Ligand binder design. Sequence first.
Ligand SMILES: *C(=O)/C=C\c1ccc(O)cc1
Length: 100
Amino acid sequence: LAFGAIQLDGDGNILQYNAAEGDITGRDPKQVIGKNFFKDVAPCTDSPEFYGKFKEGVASGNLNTMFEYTFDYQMTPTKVKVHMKKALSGDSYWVFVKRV
Ligand SMILES: *C(=O)/C=C\c1ccc(O)cc1
C-alpha cells in the first residue's frame, strides 16, 4: 500500500502516514499526521466506537485485526477494509485501509 497505510501511537497521536513521498499537490497539510488529540470533549468524529474496538485494542494489548466495513447507506463513504496492527515498536498501532 502506497496509500492507506498510517501508523499511530497507542496513546492517541498520529506519527506517520505512508504515502507522502512526493509533494505534488498544493493542499493544506493540516489534514493528516502530527495529530495530538487533546480532550476537547469530541467523541463524534464519524466514529463513536473507534475503528475496530480500538479502545479495547489498546488495553487488550493485541490490536491487530483486518475488518472490512461496507457502507450500504446513502451519505456514507466507500467500502473499506482496515488492517490494524499493534506496531512492533510497542505501544503504537497501525491502520492500513484498503477499499474494495
Ligand atoms: C455527536 O455529535 C452525536 C450527536 C449529535 C446530534 C446532533 C447534533 O447537532 C450534533 C451531534
